[PDB]
């Protein structure tokens, strides 16, 4: 009964920003932030922190392990949020900061294509993904995708603005690549997924090139109309 | 009503041989071969497993964690499948698992980590994942008992020569030796800590299988039926 909406977009595009905004605006709207974001006390933070640093230094060694733990943490986190909150809500919405589909068809895919995962790992991961989402992940099924579309330069600049030590070393080239896989999934609908229902999930796309922190009403007005057509 | 019983033992201790003898005594009795045994010679799984298997042999410190997660997923999937697929009609169903998810973690994944083939982060992520999932199933795969085929590492070493697999012909004696202690500790001395609540009180049948039993197995089988009636 809770409506499940993935916010999707490139690194430093503004999702944490958009989703922080939205949640304040109705007691029937809650967010599930992205595990990876929290990694940059708990054993998951601890595990998260190490594997992310590991990943930065040697991605062709750590990428399969990193993608495995990121997806798992997300599945877990979305469940915690779902089976917990919003049970007394009139019009409940959970906004996910990315989805298990980003995990795979953006990030993991890019790492296969860029040779930081070899073929065995990628098909091991794909097998792990196809089946972890079917055993325990079926209640996570999205009612909508919201795509926060923004330039690779926007993001580099926005990376700088946030000032995460490790991210400043991230270059335009990767952002371009990551920028490139989103468009193919969310705009053209070029992507065959192993999850057919995604063929029918309605998408909304939102231009976040312009700063929106003092000026998001048109942005939130667009979401509001989306939600009532789902 | 399905009873789930795990058959545990070192490399070449006699698990499959025994299980194949057990499957034939009872229309009521079924078996789940362990998948790394099947890769230990094909589907998409069998493709990945042969590949990941050979890579583990080539360089364990790089592939342990990858091998471990995939072996256990592949085990859990075939074991969920039997419970849903096998033995539907039978009046007293018993499913014999060739090894278990506890042997994945507390014998093999633990030992690779002790042998420094997985780091703390590889180990703690493995364990986290092993729980989340093996708490998700709430009693479905949980064991009713266990049968430990007991051999000396020395018997085990011979048996690999008989079995004849090229790619297994260098497993050294000391490798078989650490796994022995892990079995011995876990299932005979019962000194191994595990995080699984019911498993401290899981009944355990120890059979010495050092003597060739291919053509002389009746007495073993009597302990199994004997053991099975207590459940
Ligand atoms: C946001 C920090 C996560 C990182 S770190 C990283 C990285 C760092 C350094 C790299 O080069 C040395 C690198 O190159 C990839 C090599 O092909 C990737 N990529 C990533 C993106 S992969 C990813 N997968 C997810 N599933 C989720 C998520 N947020 N990110
Ligand atoms: C017998 C084929 C499976 C293999 S291969 C292997 C191995 C191979 C080469 C190695 O280095 C040369 C190796 O070194 C570990 C040294 O401490 C282990 N260990 C194993 C046992 S780990 C295992 N984990 C499971 N979960 C299941 C299972 N049957 N085996
Ligand atoms: O319209 C915007 C959206 C975001 N930001 C800034 O861009 C950086 C990255 O934003 P966010 O943390 O939302 O990135 P994401 O969650 O997409 O990785 C942050 O320091 C924000 O303060 C901004 O200046 N204008
Ligand atoms: O009583 C026995 C038991 C086993 N074996 C042989 O020893 C090898 C090891 O058996 P198996 O593969 O069943 O052991 P597992 O690894 O399954 O425990 C095989 O070639 C068996 O044919 C034997 O000669 N006599």
Curated annotation (Swiss-Prot), chain A:
Major place of residence:
nucleus
An MF annotation (GO) of this entry:
deoxyguanosine kinase activity
Q: What is its EC number?
A: 2.7.1.74, 2.7.1.76, 2.7.1.113
User: Phosphothreonine (modified residue): where?
Assistant: 42
Tell me the Gene3D superfamilies matching this sequence: P-loop containing nucleotide triphosphate hydrolases
Is Ion transport one of the keywords UniProt gives this record?
no
Fetch the SUPFAM superfamilies from UniProt: P-loop containing nucleoside triphosphate hydrolases (SSF52540)
Give the reactions, separated by semicolons, that this protein catalyses: 2'-deoxycytidine + a ribonucleoside 5'-triphosphate = dCMP + a ribonucleoside 5'-diphosphate + H(+); 2'-deoxyadenosine + ATP = dAMP + ADP + H(+); 2'-deoxyguanosine + ATP = dGMP + ADP + H(+)
InterPro entries documented for this protein: DCK/DGK, Deoxyribonucleoside_kinase, DNK_dom, P-loop_NTPase
Binding annotation for ATP: 9-17, 158-162, 210-212
- Provide the protein's localization: Nucleus
Nucleus is among the record's keywords: yes
Quote the function comment for this protein: Phosphorylates the deoxyribonucleosides deoxycytidine, deoxyguanosine and deoxyadenosine. Has broad substrate specificity, and does not display selectivity based on the chirality of the substrate. It is also an essential enzyme for the phosphorylation of numerous nucleoside analogs widely employed as antiviral and chemotherapeutic agents.
Its assembly, as annotated, is: Homodimer.
Please identify the protein, giving its name as recorded: Deoxycytidine kinase
């Amino acid at each position: 009964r809770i409506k499940k909406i993935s916010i999707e977009g490139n690194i430093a595009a503004g999702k944490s920003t958009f989703v922080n905004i939205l949640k304040q605006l109705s007691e029937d709207w809650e967010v599930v932030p992205e595990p990876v974001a929290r990694w940059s006390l708990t054993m998951e933070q601890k595990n998260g922190g190490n594997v992310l640093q590991m990943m930065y230094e040697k991605p062709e060694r750590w990428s399969f392990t990193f993608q495995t733990y990121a997806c798992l943490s997300r599945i877990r986190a979305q469940l915690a949020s779902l089976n917990g909150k919003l049970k007394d809500a009139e019009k409940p919405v959970l906004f996910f900061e990315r989805s298990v589909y980003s995990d795979r068809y953006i990030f993991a895919s890019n790492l296969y294509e860029s040779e930081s995962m070899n073929e065995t790992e990628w098909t091991i991961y794909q097998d792990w993904h196809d089946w972890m989402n079917n055993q325990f992940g079926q209640s996570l099924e999205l009612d909508g995708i919201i795509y926060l579309q923004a330039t690779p330069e926007t993001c580099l600049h926005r990376i700088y603005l946030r000032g995460r030590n490790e991210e400043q070393g991230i270059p335009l080239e990767y952002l371009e690549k990551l920028h490139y896989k989103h468009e193919s999934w969310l705009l053209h609908r070029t992507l065959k997924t192993n999850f057919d229902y995604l063929q029918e999930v309605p998408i909304l796309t939102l231009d976040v090139n312009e700063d929106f922190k003092d000026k998001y009403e048109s942005l939130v007005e667009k979401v509001k109309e989306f939600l009532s057509t789902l």
